[PDB]
Amino acid sequence: KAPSHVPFLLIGGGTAAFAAARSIRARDPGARVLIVSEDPELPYMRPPLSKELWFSDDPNVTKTLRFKQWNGKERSIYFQPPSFYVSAQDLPHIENGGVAVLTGKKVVQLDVRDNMVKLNDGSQITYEKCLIATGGTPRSLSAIDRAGAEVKSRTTLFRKIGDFRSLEKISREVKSITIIGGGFLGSELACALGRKARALGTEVIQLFPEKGNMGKILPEYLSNWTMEKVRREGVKVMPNAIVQSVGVSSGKLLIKLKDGRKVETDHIVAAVGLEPNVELAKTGGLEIDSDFGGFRVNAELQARSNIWVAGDAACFYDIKLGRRRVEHHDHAVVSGRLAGENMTGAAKPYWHQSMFWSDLGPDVGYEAIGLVDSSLPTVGVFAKATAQDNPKSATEQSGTGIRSESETESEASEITIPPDYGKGVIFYLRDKVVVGIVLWNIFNRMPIARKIIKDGEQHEDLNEVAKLFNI
Numbered sequence: 001k002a003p004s005h006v007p008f009l010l011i012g013g014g015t016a017a018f019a020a021a022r023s024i025r026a027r028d029p030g031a032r033v034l035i036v037s038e039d040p041e042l043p044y045m046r047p048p049l050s051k052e053l054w055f056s057d058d059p060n061v062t063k064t065l066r067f068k069q070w071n072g073k074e075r076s077i078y079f080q081p082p083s084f085y086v087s088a089q090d091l092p093h094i095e096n097g098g099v100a101v102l103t104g105k106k107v108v109q110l111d112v113r114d115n116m117v118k119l120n121d122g123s124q125i126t127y128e129k130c131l132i133a134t135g136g137t138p139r140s141l142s143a144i145d146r147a148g149a150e151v152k153s154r155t156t157l158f159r160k161i162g163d164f165r166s167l168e169k170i171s172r173e174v175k176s177i178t179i180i181g182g183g184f185l186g187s188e189l190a191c192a193l194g195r196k197a198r199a200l201g202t203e204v205i206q207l208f209p210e211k212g213n214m215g216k217i218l219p220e221y222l223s224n225w226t227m228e229k230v231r232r233e234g235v236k237v238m239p240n241a242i243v244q245s246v247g248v249s250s251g252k253l254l255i256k257l258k259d260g261r262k263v264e265t266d267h268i269v270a271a272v273g274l275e276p277n278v279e280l281a282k283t284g285g286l287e288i289d290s291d292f293g294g295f296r297v298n299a300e301l302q303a304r305s306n307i308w309v310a311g312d313a314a315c316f317y318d319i320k321l322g323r324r325r326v327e328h329h330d331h332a333v334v335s336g337r338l339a340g341e342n343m344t345g346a347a348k349p350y351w352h353q354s355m356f357w358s359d360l361g362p363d364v365g366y367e368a369i370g371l372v373d374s375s376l377p378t379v380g381v382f383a384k385a386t387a388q389d390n391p392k393s394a395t396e397q398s399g400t401g402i403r404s405e406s407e408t409e410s411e412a413s414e415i416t417i418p419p420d421y422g423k424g425v426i427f428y429l430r431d432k433v434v435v436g437i438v439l440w441n442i443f444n445r446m447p448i449a450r451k452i453i454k455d456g457e458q459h460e461d462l463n464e465v466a467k468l469f470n471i
């Protein structure tokens, strides 16, 4: 089925590859683009898998994957209808070109000098320009790694459609599920599973070594508030939990913690970060970053004269922060688009400041930008929330749940300071300069946050700065 040659080859069929395909076709209306995708699905967005797809009373949603946004309006998880793609066989000579996807196929060898890749089925494909957009593989716990096949078979590493379907099934079938990891994803899943368990009368546990949810990122006040929110959903949250081992004890999973607590459960979900998919660097002879992970690229996202990297797999040069890798939807879209533009001769640098967002449900959301690390000095400024300061209202206003879309990618032109907390802004500092911002239930203000960080001025009074965020 695979053609012998394609002008544009995109390795991996995720968010970054789809953005690049769209960019290439916009700039070159007759372009011929092939996406090679190891997963059996056509390109789709990930955020709904831990969010709106769980907030449903319709059993058909697991089959269609057409979810309802917080505003009640339906959207498909897929970036475009399957009929918008051309067949890989037709690609070389179909009038006006198109975008094809080879699903269920892995690129296993990259030969840079020969502009060639080899698939797992032995197929050889040459390219003129290549994007690596392979994303990452979920990290496991060493305690699970060392526990043997039975424990492993009863642990979900949450990333794909397949994991959504298998976990949604498990949540209807078993009595107890344990999430390991306190980050945004672990916490989203805790809230999603918690809501399911309430209707079924079952148990959800979330455990992590930090003092509270998102403890590596949020300062203690807001980390603690989040833990209480998750507890209000019915979830048993266990902070200061260091996993010693995991075994099977008369049919149940048994998690032993260093402090002496034991946790008995039916299934485990791990959400403890990501290992960038860099296997192709071996045969490709490409440099990887041993400190931050990922393929090292220049300002234009090039690994080689005709090889670019975008999305989760890229270790890029952040304009403010230096060598960096992120796991942001926004980054995958903007870096993928830019790769596509540069593959069609734009030669433009990656200067975008990537934003991140998380919704715990329709009532609580976060946004983040820049260097966000709870070990840094911070200043938090908080206020009571208004009726509009929640993900649902933000989605009602914008028409979308993908916040990188509603926020805009832009930075504000100017930021003239105007002359039971439920929202706020948190500034992360270096010598009175703001290097990162977290927004709690404040929407449509990311351009202001980008402007503050880009300008890099010293600020005498952060309480004045907070007025820009309507605090």
Ligand SMILES: Cc1cc2nc3c(=O)[nH]c(=O)nc-3n(C[C@H](O)[C@H](O)[C@H](O)COP(=O)(O)OP(=O)(O)OC[C@H]3O[C@@H](n4cnc5c(N)ncnc54)[C@H](O)[C@@H]3O)c2cc1C
Binding pocket: 011, 012, 013, 014, 015, 016, 017, 036, 037, 038, 039, 045, 046, 047, 048, 049, 050, 105, 106, 107, 108, 133, 134, 135, 136, 158, 159, 160, 185, 277, 310, 311, 312, 313, 326, 327, 328, 329, 330, 332, 355, 356, 357, 358, 359
């Ligand atoms: C459940 C979940 C929820 C998330 N929610 C948010 C959110 O709310 N906000 C936010 O900012 N970010 C969120 N993220 C992160 C965001 O989704 C990612 O940053 C984004 O998916 C990265 O896109 P990508 O194209 O780089 O990688 P991916 O989407 O991982 O795509 C990579 C693809 O390449 C395939 N592949 C790998 N190797 C090969 C190979 N050799 N040959 C062929 N194919 C290969 C993989 O199977 C995969 O399909 C979430 C992530 C997850 C998993």
